Design a protein around this ligand. Structure first.
Ligand code: CLA
Ligand code: CLA
Ligand code: CLA
Ligand code: CLA
Ligand code: CLA
Ligand code: CLA
Ligand code: CLA
Ligand code: CLA
Ligand SMILES: CC1=C(/C=C/C(C)=C/C=C/C(C)=C/C=C/C=C(C)/C=C/C=C(C)/C=C/C2=C(C)CCCC2(C)C)C(C)(C)CCC1
Ligand SMILES: CC1=C(C/C=C(\C)CCC[C@H](C)CCC[C@H](C)CCCC(C)C)C(=O)c2ccccc2C1=O
Ligand code: SF4
Ligand code: SF4
Lengths: 80, 37, 63, 74, 734, 165
């Protein structure tokens, strides 16, 4: 399983969620920014680490990171 | 007092070319695939 | 109240920012309880092609 | 434009007629370099009282196959 | 599944792929990142591993002694070594055919032996071996010693004898013993062996383990040593009419200072080497009492580091707090060790081609070639390792707050200046070197060879005139007969050195000209470039502007994906990865250059070098093309000869090399899809869907394939050049 | 002489190479006529060749054992023995023109940063301004040492340095 962490510079623009091809990110209520939202990663056992969430983040140096870790049969994307 | 015999390459070469690789690879292959209880 | 006024030029001190030690222009300063209220534009773009970023109060200097 | 260049260089800067007079022993040449820093050694002795770079593109055999006998037609 | 292999990393022994096998082979010696690794356990494992390495070294040397003593002809080689070739070992290959064995049987043997291009024969003849029996005794002894070291390595893991952590990290007590004991006493004892055995064997005698207790090494003996008459050990040394293995012109001296070479054997005198090891034994033993142990007078290294911060603050804190990072980290110490050992290795090569120590060296030319090339390539790899462990130090063991203001933080503060100026010198040397070579090529191609730039290397010729080479007409400091240095050294240690430096037949201070100018600049280009890549990788390991948290990923991580324009090869591992190619190139240049200059020296025409060395066609035609005539004729449809094995290795290298390109050029995912279709095919094939994988097959990971491609590149490169060098030099002169 | 060689005037290898080149050239010349443009070009080559040898002999060049000229790169040595025209004068000439190019470029860059769209005037050259600055810097070194001594040549530490340390 990989390590996906959301940081506090998030502005809650939902770009990371629409870019995730595996549905491991979701938007939770929050009271720290104008949009009153913040991303969260409740299902990092389904993540494969494609790093589209990092590409979609607008704020400079990113508000979401994907640290690579120990692979499994789901995090390798093996269909056989 | 030490001398290896005249027939020594003939025996020791295929031993270390064929036998020890065979035992090594078979033993290691059983070791690799073992399941932890 | 809380921040420098719009149109003014500021200087970034947040290190991980791509525009560290450079000059930007302020757009708006949020008055609410946001953690990062200062919206700064820049005339060049970072690697990702974005030219706008939020910053904290102490990380910008009127210069 | 390219074909026109080839026919022009065949017409003006070659030894096509000297080649038609004797195809063996006279090698096809259709390019002449200018006498500057020393590149003039590239002008080879191609036969026929001519000097230049031997061509392998084989326009001369094509022209003889079409019937061209003079540089004016080129 | 949750397989056993490997036990050091639980997360690795978890996945059902074939990644676990390769990674389990790859992370075995990464002790710092196993499961449950404390610090004491780390040091103890490193200690036992050192014992393992020592065991392997001594066992290997015993192997060399045994094979030379059994299958070689060392007993016959010592009678005439400008003749019958050395013998390494004998072959028993059932794949041979009749002319093969008929061909390989050479050197006076009775079967397929192959020549020993290693220089062990000259070493063992100089130090004082003469028969087989002594070699066997040495082999048995070294095998026994290897067994002792292996047992000790097992011993110090047993839980009663495990040293605690603070026994390690004891700097001051380790250096006194290393410097005094390990260097000084070993050097003193080696002087003992030279004086007692090696000299009287070179006078003609058999001083063995029998009757070395009853033989005077000098016919006065420990009277002048205890009187203070030491110059009575140097009177009447060996005459220049000497014959080495006999008593003809034999002297009596044991500690001289002559310089020069032996007039009949083209090596250094043994008495000088006795005196040298004696002198530096005294120096090292005296230098071993600097630091503090459980006594009074010693030094503290922390005080010494603390007090050296300069006033005016040109350095911030100077060396404050370094002692708690040199002591606390292993990659820092390993980096320093690899740096020193690599530079010393180069020095070994550079001195052993020019000042040959061993008897009848430099008349076996293949020995010279293989020795120098070997040590050069070894030095290259060692230096690359030094910078790699620098990068690992920065990522894993560096702490900023402990290093606030010392020189180590200053180096991280202004690193862009370093990288910029290394880039500048690399560019400058590249443009001008390549330009001058291309200009000389163009001039040579047209009919005018006098229109080309041939700069005379006047600096190095100034230096060679400073050392005594009286050919350039400069007349100063050792070449002038009225200098202070010349007159002071004249009476005892100059006249050998001058006769050895004005000879144009030895390798000592070869005559140089414009080709040497150009090639030395090429070498400087190699060094500055490789330093650029390595230093950039080391200093940008904490983070860059493309990525300011590179420290959170560790040393060797693949990439950061397509974002921000895509970041391939961003890790420090990949910087070192790029540097390896430059190391191979640069050593290629120095070794091509050395080899060709000495080929033209040994053949006879230095003119061919001094003319054809100034334009690259000279290299391609007169070195690579002309000298590979007897190599590739190692076998043909007409027959084969001795150098057929080399002519097969020579293609083998290319094959490995070209396979090396595959893992570099074609990156991963293509192979992933191909392997997936293969999985489908083996899954649906009838009568072969009865045999399955236990661990699912996947393609090689991004980091691994770089290492594999580099392995093929390096191995093929080395095998090809070794084949060409041995085959060419031993085909001509051998 | 200068590191064990001789000047090309009495160098035996020099005249041998000269004779060899003339020999091959006349060998090429033999098979043509006396009015043909081949022979015209060949005789032109003879003239240029012999003139080149005379020019290299006249300038006091130094030849090794191959009969080829050798350049001396040392200020004291070349200035003492009359060889300032092979490295020394060329290096000062090149440094002049190279600093000239660099200075002109830099002045253009500062001249165009002060506009409303610096990128357009970088991709589309302001030709009047470029020719103007192309003239205005023929004496660059004086302006360079003035910019150095006033402290405007160097930006201060408002340059962007990598984060972090
Ligand atoms: C470590 C150094 C070393 C090396 C590289 C070699 C190399 C060789 N030996 Mg050898 N040998 C050595 C030491 C060495 N020897 C010693 C110390 C002895 C005395 C016991 C011998 C006695 C010996 C005989 C009697 C014969 C050879 C022969 C050979 C050749 C065929 C290979 C073979 O069958 O070896 C067999 C080698 C041995 C049985 C001795 C090895 C003993 C140690 C304990 C093993 C070391 C284990 C090793 C480090 C672990 C690597 C494996 C690991 C990767 C899984 C080959 C050239 C044959 C030959 O000459 O053919 C022409 C042959 O008949 N060797
Ligand atoms: C397309 C094929 C082709 C090729 C490869 C060549 C190649 C050559 N020709 Mg040639 N030629 C061609 C077609 C070609 N020609 C045609 C079609 C004709 C008939 C009009 C000629 C007539 C011709 C003559 C009469 C001569 C050559 C010569 C030459 C040689 C020297 C050219 C030279 O020095 O240029 C000189 C360099 C320039 C003119 C530089 C111009 C570059 C400008 C400034 C670029 C500006 C950019 C601009 C936006 C784009 C150009 C637009 C255009 C309308 C100008 C060279 C081998 C000479 C030769 O063989 O001597 C022995 C010669 O005397 N050619
Ligand atoms: C100088 C040679 C040398 C030495 C001293 C060691 C020493 C060691 N290796 Mg090792 N190893 C070596 C070469 C060497 N290896 C080579 C050439 C490979 C193939 C790449 C490996 C692959 C390897 C693996 C895969 C493992 C070891 C392990 C070990 C440790 C246990 C030793 C044992 O018998 O079990 C020990 C520190 C084992 C361990 O757990 O180490 C911590 C382990 O799992 N080694
Ligand atoms: C006098 C006592 C003494 C002696 C002899 C040694 C000796 C050694 N210690 Mg040691 N040690 C000592 C006291 C001593 N120590 C004390 C008191 C402590 C506690 C502070 C330690 C703590 C300690 C640790 C923690 C470790 C050692 C290690 C070692 C070994 C180093 C590896 C090696 O072989 O280097 C050999 C080096 C040389 C022979 C010198 C090389 C000199 C130059 C570079 C070579 C060139 C010379 C010449 C040209 C070569 C000729 C070539 C020839 C083939 C022709 C070595 C056996 C290490 C080891 O291997 O553990 C097993 C290790 O990890 N020791
Ligand atoms: C570690 C190396 C080493 C060893 C083990 C020996 C050992 C020996 N040498 Mg020897 N020697 C050495 C180095 C060594 N030497 C060196 C470097 C030289 C050159 C200066 C000599 C020159 C030499 C000569 C010329 C002679 C010996 C002799 C001897 C033998 C008698 C010495 C004796 O009774 O001491 C005397 C007893 C003492 C207590 C004095 C030693 C005190 C020292 C200074 C303290 C140790 C520190 C003895 C076998 C003599 C002999 O009979 O050989 C067969 C002999 O004639 N050696
Ligand atoms: C003093 C010697 C020394 C020591 C003790 C170490 C120790 C270490 N190094 Mg290191 N290193 C050294 C020299 C040394 N290195 C040199 C000289 C280089 C330059 C090449 C490097 C380059 C280097 C890199 C780049 C890295 C290390 C790493 C490491 C650490 C883990 C090693 C590991 O897991 O490898 C396991 C070892 C293997 C899997 C063996 C692989 C086999 C190689 C590819 C050779 C194969 C060639 C083949 C045998 C040819 C056969 C020919 C055929 C025809 C028969 C460890 C602390 C790694 C680390 O710290 O990770 C963060 C790391 O990234 N080192
Ligand atoms: C790149 C470095 C370098 C090197 C290795 C040399 C090498 C040499 N120069 Mg030299 N030189 C250089 C750069 C260099 N030059 C530059 C840049 C200048 C311009 C300032 C000079 C100006 C110069 C003069 C004016 C003279 C030399 C001379 C010499 C020769 C002997 C003096 C010497 O080595 O001093 C060591 C040089 C250095 C450590 C490099 C720094 C450069 C200094 C300034 C030159 C030192 C000159 C020296 C003091 C004169 C000694 C007189 C001699 C009779 C004893 C020697 C071949 C002398 C000569 O003609 O010899 C026959 C001489 O008269 N040089
Ligand atoms: C004209 C502006 C200009 C100026 C003032 C400089 C100045 C400098 N460059 Mg640089 N450079 C430039 C353009 C310029 N460069 C361009 C266009 C490129 C390629 C895209 C480079 C590529 C480059 C590299 C790769 C490196 C430098 C380096 C350097 C520094 C050392 C000098 C050097 O090595 O030059 C060498 C110059 C080159 C290799 C290329 C020069 C290209 C042409 C000749 C210049 C451009 C002329 C310009 C188009 C004219 C436009 C003006 C006109 C519109 C009026 C120096 C500060 C080096 C450095 O960092 O040193 C610390 C270094 O590593 N530069
Ligand atoms: C990265 C890194 C690292 C590493 C580094 C390195 C690797 C380095 C190297 C370095 C080197 C490798 C250096 C070298 C040096 C050398 C020198 C410095 C030399 C000197 C010499 C001399 C001084 C000489 C002199 C003389 C002469 C001239 C002759 C005569 C004699 C005499 C002696 C006088 C470390 C680990 C630290 C850590 C951090 C990071
Ligand atoms: C061929 C290839 C593969 C496919 C490679 C595979 C599937 C492995 C092939 C190895 C076979 C299975 C065995 C090779 C035989 C060796 C002798 C094995 C040595 C094992 C050591 C332990 C000795 C990749 O996965 C890849 C990934 C990234 C870049 C380039 C490439 C690439 O070029
Ligand atoms: S790496 Fe891919 S799967 Fe994982 S969170 Fe990001 S977008 Fe989703
Ligand atoms: S893309 Fe970035 S800023 Fe936008 S919601 Fe996701 S993490 Fe937050």
């Amino acid at each position: 399983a990989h390590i996906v962490k959301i940081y506090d510079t998030c502005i809650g623009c939902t770009q990371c969620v629409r870019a995730c091809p595996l549905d491991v990110l979701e938007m939770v209520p929050w009271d720290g920014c104008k949009a009153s939202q913040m991303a969260s990663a409740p299902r990092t056992e389904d993540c494969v680490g494609c790093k589209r969430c990092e590409t979609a983040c607008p704020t400079d140096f990113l508000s979401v990171r994907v640290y690579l870790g120990s692979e499994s049969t789901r995090s390798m994307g093996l269909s056989y | 007092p030490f001398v290896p015999p005249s027939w020594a390459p003939s025996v020791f070469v295929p031993l270390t070319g064929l036998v020890l690789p065979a035992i090594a690879m078979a033993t290691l292959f059983v070791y690799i695939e073992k399941e932890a209880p | 109240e809380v921040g420098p006024k719009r149109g003014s030029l500021v200087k970034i001190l947040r290190p991980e920012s791509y525009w560290f030690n450079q000059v930007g222009k302020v757009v708006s300063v949020d008055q609410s309880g946001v953690r990062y209220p200062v919206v700064v534009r820049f005339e060049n773009q970072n690697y990702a092609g974005v030219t706008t970023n939020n910053y904290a109060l102490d990380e910008v200097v009127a210069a | 434009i390219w074909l026109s260049g080839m026919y022009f260089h065949g017409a003006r800067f070659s030894n096509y007629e000297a080649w038609l007079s004797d195809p063996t022993h006279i090698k096809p040449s259709a390019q002449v370099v200018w006498p500057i820093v020393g590149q003039e050694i590239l002008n080879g002795d191609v036969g026929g009282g001519f000097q230049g770079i031997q061509i392998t593109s084989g326009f001369f055999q094509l022209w003889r196959a079409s019937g061209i006998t003079s540089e004016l037609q080129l | 599944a949750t397989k056993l292999f490997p036990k050091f990393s639980q997360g690795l022994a978890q996945d059902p792929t074939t990644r676990r096998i390769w990674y389990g082979l790859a992370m075995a010696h990464d002790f710092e990142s196993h499961d449950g690794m404390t610090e004491e356990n780390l040091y103890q494992k490193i200690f036992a591993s050192h014992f393992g390495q020592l065991s392997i070294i001594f066992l290997w040397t015993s192997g060399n002694l045994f094979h030379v003593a059994w299958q070689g002809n060392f007993e016959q080689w010592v009678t005439d070594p400008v003749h019958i070739r050395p013998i390494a070992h004998a072959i028993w290959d059932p794949h041979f055919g009749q002319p093969a064995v008929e061909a390989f049987t050479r050197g006076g043997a009775s079967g397929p032996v192959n020549i020993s291009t290693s220089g062990v024969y000259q070493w063992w003849y100089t130090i004082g071996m003469r028969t087989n029996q002594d070699l066997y005794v040495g082999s048995v002894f070294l095998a026994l010693v290897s067994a002792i070291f292996l047992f000790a390595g097992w011993l110090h893991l047993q839980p009663n004898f495990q040293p605690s952590l603070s026994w390690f990290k004891d700097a001051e007590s380790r250096l006194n013993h290393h410097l005094s004991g390990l260097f000084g006493v070993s050097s003193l004892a080696w002087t003992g062996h030279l004086v007692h055995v090696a000299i009287p064997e070179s006078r003609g005698q058999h001083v063995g383990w029998d009757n070395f207790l009853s033989v005077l090494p000098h016919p006065q003996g420990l009277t002048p040593f205890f009187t203070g008459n030491w110059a009575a050990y140097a009177q009447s040394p060996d005459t220049a009419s000497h014959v080495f293995g006999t008593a003809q012109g034999s002297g009596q001296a044991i500690l001289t200072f002559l310089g020069g070479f032996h007039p009949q054997t083209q090596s250094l005198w043994l008495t000088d080497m006795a005196h040298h090891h004696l002198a530096i034994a005294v120096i090292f033993i005296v230098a071993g009492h600097m630091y503090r142990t459980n006594f009074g007078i010693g030094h503290r290294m922390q005080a010494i580091l603390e007090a050296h911060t300069p006033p005016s603050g040109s350095l911030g804190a100077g060396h404050k707090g370094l002692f708690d990072t040199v002591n606390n980290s292993l990659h820092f110490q390993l980096g320093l060790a690899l740096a020193s050992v690599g530079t010393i290795t180069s020095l070994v090569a550079q001195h052993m081609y020019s000042l040959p120590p061993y008897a009848f060296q430099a008349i076996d030319f293949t020995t010279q070639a293989a020795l120098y090339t070997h040590h050069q390539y070894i030095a290259g790899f060692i230096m690359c390792g030094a910078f790699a462990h620098g990068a690992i130090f920065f990522i894993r063991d560096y702490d900023p707050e402990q290093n606030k203001g010392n020189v180590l933080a200053r180096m991280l503060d202004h690193k862009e200046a370093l990288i910029s100026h290394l880039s500048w010198v690399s560019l400058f040397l590249g443009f001008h070197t390549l330009g001058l070579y291309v200009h000389n090529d163009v001039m040579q191609a047209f009919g005018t060879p006098e229109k080309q730039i041939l700069i005379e290397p006047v600096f190095a010729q100034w230096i060679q005139a400073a050392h005594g080479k009286a050919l350039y007409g400069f007349d100063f400091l050792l070449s002038s007969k009225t200098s202070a240095a010349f007159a002071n050294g004249q009476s005892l240690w100059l006249p050998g050195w001058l006769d050895a430096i004005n000879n144009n037949q030895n390798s000592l201070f070869l005559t140089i000209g414009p080709g040497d100018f150009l090639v030395h600049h090429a070498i400087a280009l190699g060094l500055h470039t490789t330093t650029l890549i390595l230093v950039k990788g080391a200093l940008d390991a904490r983070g860059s502007k493309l990525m300011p948290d590179k420290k959170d990923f560790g040393y060797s991580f693949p990439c950061d994906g397509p974002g921000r324009g895509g970041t391939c090869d961003i890790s420090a591992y990949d910087a070192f990865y790029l540097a390896v190619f430059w190391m191979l190139n640069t050593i290629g240049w120095v070794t091509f250059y050395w080899h060709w200059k000495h080929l033209t020296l040994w053949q006879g025409n230095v003119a061919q070098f001094d003319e054809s060395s100034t334009y690259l066609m000279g290299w391609l035609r007169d070195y690579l093309w002309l000298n590979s005539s007897q190599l590739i004729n190692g076998y043909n449809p007409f027959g084969m000869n001795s150098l057929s094995v080399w002519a097969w290795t020579f293609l083998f290298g290319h094959l490995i090399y070209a396979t090396g390109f595959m893992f570099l050029i074609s990156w991963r995912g293509y192979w992933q899809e191909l392997i997936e279709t293969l999985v489908w095919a083996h899954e649906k094939t009838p009568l072969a869907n009865l045999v399955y994988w236990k661990d699912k097959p996947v393609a090689l990971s991004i980091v691994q394939a770089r290492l594999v491609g580099l392995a093929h590149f390096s191995v093929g490169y080395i095998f090809t050049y070794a084949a060409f060098l041995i085959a060419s030099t031993s085909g001509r002169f051998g | 002489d200068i590191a064990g060689l001789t000047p090309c005037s009495e160098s035996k290898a020099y005249a041998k190479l000269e004779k060899k080149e003339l020999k091959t050239l006349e060998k090429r010349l033999k098979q043509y006529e006396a009015d043909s443009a081949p022979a015209v070009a060949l005789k032109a080559t003879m003239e240029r060749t012999k003139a080149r040898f005379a020019n290299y002999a006249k300038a006091g060049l130094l030849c090794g054992n191959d009969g080829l000229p050798h350049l001396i790169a040392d200020p004291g040595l070349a200035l003492k023995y009359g060889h300032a025209g092979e490295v020394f004068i060329p290096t000062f000439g090149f440094l002049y023109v190279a600093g000239y190019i660099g200075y002109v470029g830099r002045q253009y860059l500062i001249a165009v940063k002060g506009e409303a769209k610096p990128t357009d005037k970088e991709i589309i050259i302001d030709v009047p301004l470029a020719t103007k600055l192309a003239w205005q810097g023929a004496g660059w070194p004086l302006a360079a040492v003035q910019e150095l001594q006033r402290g405007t040549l160097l930006e201060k530490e408002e340059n962007i340095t990598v984060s972090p340390r």
